[PDB]
């Protein structure tokens, strides 16, 4: 990374470079600042209303609560909430503080200790089939904690029920609260229970002396989408000022990237937050605070070539920027000799009016050479010596001698 000559040395995997022109990496602009743009929300998410609820719902009638316009600072749960199970599927836990969530829904219920494992996208079992099923492409986090000190009674807590004997497996995120009598045998039932007809709901025991597998467990499943919609629930990240027309790192509603932000003429629809090009890259974004549309442009741009007479001859090099017009410049350095040929700006080579045979092909009719102090010179290549034929309507040229030439062709 010291200079284009060293980059060419590294690319060639050698300490010596022969005479010529070598394409290096494109011109790179490193970000200068880092900015975070989150919607201005001060209210904390209802952690007490979810994890501290006095009464929880049954698994067959699991409760769904919408979470919106809040900051998910889950560290407040560190004081009093201890969770036996905390598994996130569509997001890494360590990134949860740097993201914004679109449609946050908390599904709360109470199950057995042995049935906690059944709360997963691809599990089978009584709860997974008849009570609560997670989608295969589930994005969210499942949290479960033992509640034996709350949901257990000495005589037996029978307020929590689970669905048994269902005709077919439940669809993902589907709720069945019907109490119709199940027909296990071939004999039809007429609303009464007997022999092969049973009530579909059965109550848990939930006694304090029960085993850890038979003890009550409170389960909250948080489901949300990421980096696709406006979103209104955000992490505990402090927003900074908006920087435009500069190469910066940006964190827009959890979407991180690097680029230059400029004012955009695009008119986003009210339900749209991000814009993408034909390459699926985020090229437009709506500011969560000012509600303005900003175009994002990559910082790196422009091909770079390095011309050297050979490390065995000299260490002097010339730099050609194929997408820079020298008439601040997007160049590594601008030292004295600046020519600005076609096909880019040439820095480090002295332009001469003389025409020679091409030594190092720069391009667009421009060549470079190492001439005599010794320095790199750039010139327009000569097509050949100029001639005129003494043509006339009554004049001819006839040879009076000849030469026997022997040439060599290598194939």
């Amino acid at each position: 990374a010291l200079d284009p000559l060293s980059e060419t040395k590294c690319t060639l995997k050698s300490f010596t470079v022969e005479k010529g022109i070598y394409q290096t990496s494109n011109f790179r602009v490193q970000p200068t600042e880092s900015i975070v743009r989150f919607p201005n929300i001060t209210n904390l998410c209802p952690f007490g209303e979810v994890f501290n609820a006095t009464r929880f719902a049954s698994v067959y009638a699991w409760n769904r609560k919408r979470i919106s316009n809040c900051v998910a600072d889950y560290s407040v749960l560190y004081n009093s909430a201890s969770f036996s199970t905390f598994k996130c599927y569509g997001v890494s836990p360590t990134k949860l503080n740097d993201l914004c969530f679109t449609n946050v829904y908390a599904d709360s219920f109470v199950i057995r200790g042995d049935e906690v494992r059944q709360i997963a996208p691809g599990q089978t079992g009584k709860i997974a089939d008849y009570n609560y099923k997670l989608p295969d492409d589930f994005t969210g986090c499942v949290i479960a904690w033992n509640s034996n000190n709350l949901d257990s009674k000495v005589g037996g807590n029978y307020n929590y029920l689970y669905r048994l004997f269902r005709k077919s497996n439940l669809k993902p995120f589907e709720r069945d609260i019907s109490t119709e009598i199940y027909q296990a045998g071939s004999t039809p039932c007429n609303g009464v229970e007997g022999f092969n007809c049973y009530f579909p709901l059965q109550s848990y025991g939930f006694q304090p002396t029960n085993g850890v597998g038979y003890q009550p467990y409170r389960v909250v499943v948080l489901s949300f989408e990421l980096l696709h919609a406006p979103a209104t629930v955000c992490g505990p990240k402090k927003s900074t000022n908006l920087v435009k027309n500069k190469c910066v790192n940006f964190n827009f509603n959890g979407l991180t990237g690097t680029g230059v932000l400029t004012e955009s003429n695009k008119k986003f629809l009210p339900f749209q937050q991000f814009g993408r090009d034909i390459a699926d890259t985020t090229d437009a974004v709506r500011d969560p605070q000012t509600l303005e549309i900003l175009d994002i442009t990559p910082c790196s741009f422009g091909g770079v070539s390095v011309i050297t007479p050979g490390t065995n001859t000299s260490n002097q090099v010339a730099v050609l920027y194929q997408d820079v017009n020298c008439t601040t410049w997007r160049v590594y350095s601008t030292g004295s000799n600046v020519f600005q040929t076609r096909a880019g700006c040439l820095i480090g080579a002295e332009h001469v009016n003389n025409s020679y045979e091409c030594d190092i092909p720069i391009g667009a009719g421009i060549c470079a050479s190492y001439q005599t102090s010794q320095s790199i010179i750039a010139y327009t290549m000569s097509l050949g010596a100029e001639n005129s034929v003494a043509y006339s309507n009554n004049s001819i040229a006839i040879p009076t001698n000849f030469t026997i030439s022997v040439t060599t062709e290598i194939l």
Binding site: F301, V389, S392
Partner: protein, 339 residues
């Protein structure tokens, strides 16, 4: 066709963009990017080599004669006009106007691609993904000058300048010897000189009219340019493929997963984009081999039809070959075969 578009690929820019973690992971491959760049550099050098072989056969630059007394034969349509900034012929101007290149020039500045133009402009999208287009070593003006020298030599000297030491000869006697070369006595040429000159002028005018009309007949060069542009656009478009990962955007994965969980997705994306680059380079190599064969044929035709009279049937036009005249064209050559 003589040459094709020379391209260079910044593999780190294409695969990873500005992602530092993705570049660090891509460092575990290393040699594949170097191999692709070596193949692309070989193709780019071969393009200039083909152009030099086709057009720089003679190193002895002959100018247009002042008098232009060629026994009734008119070459102003294939001779340059100094009024044009580029010293190319009127037919050469027509050929240049009938082929549309992807980019008018070769310098697209950062300010020109800043904003929404990074998406609307295909060149901006290609360059923002590490795909650059290198200009030919020889400009159109120099190729026009080489064609000018060849035409001046073949009209003033005939075949002698192709063997060195150009010898002047009146164009009527050159036509007489060319008639003798196809089995027709020179008295036929001398007794029908006005008629032959009139027919040659009429044929040149007919070619000019055909070129000036909507009939292009220059589909090969346009096909080459469109193939190169389509290959670059497909390379740009293939960046939206997930390759089995959760997303096709490295930024979304990095903001969505930690290092360990995002490593597999970034590896999948890197493998897919490397495969896309390899496919593009292989297709470019095959097309470069085809273009090299075409350029070798063009150089052979320039040697055997412009620098001399060929006895090979249907090698320099249909009929008994008399002479040929070269003309430059975007990424190609146009031979006017007089038979």
């Amino acid at each position: 066709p003589v040459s094709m578009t020379k391209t260079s690929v910044d593999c780190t820019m294409y695969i990873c963009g500005d992602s530092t973690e993705c570049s660090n992971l891509l460092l575990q491959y290393g040699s594949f990017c170097t191999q692709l760049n070596r193949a692309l550099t070989g193709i780019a050098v071969e393009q200039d080599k083909n152009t030099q072989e086709v057009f720089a056969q003679v190193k002895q630059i002959y100018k247009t004669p002042p008098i232009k007394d060629f026994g009734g034969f008119n070459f102003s349509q294939i001779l340059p006009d100094p009024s044009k900034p580029s010293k190319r012929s009127f037919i050469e101007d027509l050929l240049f106007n009938k082929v549309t290149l992807a980019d008018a020039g070769f310098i697209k500045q950062y300010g020109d691609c800043l904003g929404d133009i990074a998406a609307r402009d295909l060149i901006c999208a290609q360059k923002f993904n590490g795909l650059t287009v290198l200009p030919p070593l020889l400009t159109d003006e120099m190729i026009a000058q080489y064609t000018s020298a060849l035409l001046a030599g073949t009209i003033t000297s005939g075949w002698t300048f192709g063997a060195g030491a150009a010898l002047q000869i009146p164009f009527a006697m050159q036509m007489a010897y060319r008639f003798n070369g196809i089995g027709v006595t020179q008295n036929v040429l001398y007794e029908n000189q006005k008629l032959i000159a009139n027919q040659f002028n009429s044929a040149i005018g007919k070619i000019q009219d055909s070129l000036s009309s909507t009939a292009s007949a220059l589909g090969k060069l346009q096909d080459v340019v469109n193939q190169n542009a389509q290959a670059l656009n497909t390379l740009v478009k293939q960046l939206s493929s997930n390759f089995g990962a959760i997303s096709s955007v490295l930024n979304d994965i990095l903001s969505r997963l930690d290092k360990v969980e995002a490593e597999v997705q970034i590896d999948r994306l890197i493998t897919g984009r490397l495969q896309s680059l390899q496919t593009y380079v292989t297709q470019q190599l095959i097309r470069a081999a085809e273009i090299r064969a075409s350029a070798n044929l063009a150089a052979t035709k320039m040697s055997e039809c412009v620098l001399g009279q060929s006895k090979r049937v249907d090698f320099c036009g249909k009929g008994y070959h008399l002479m040929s005249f070269p003309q430059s064209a975007p990424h190609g050559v146009v031979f006017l075969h007089v038979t």
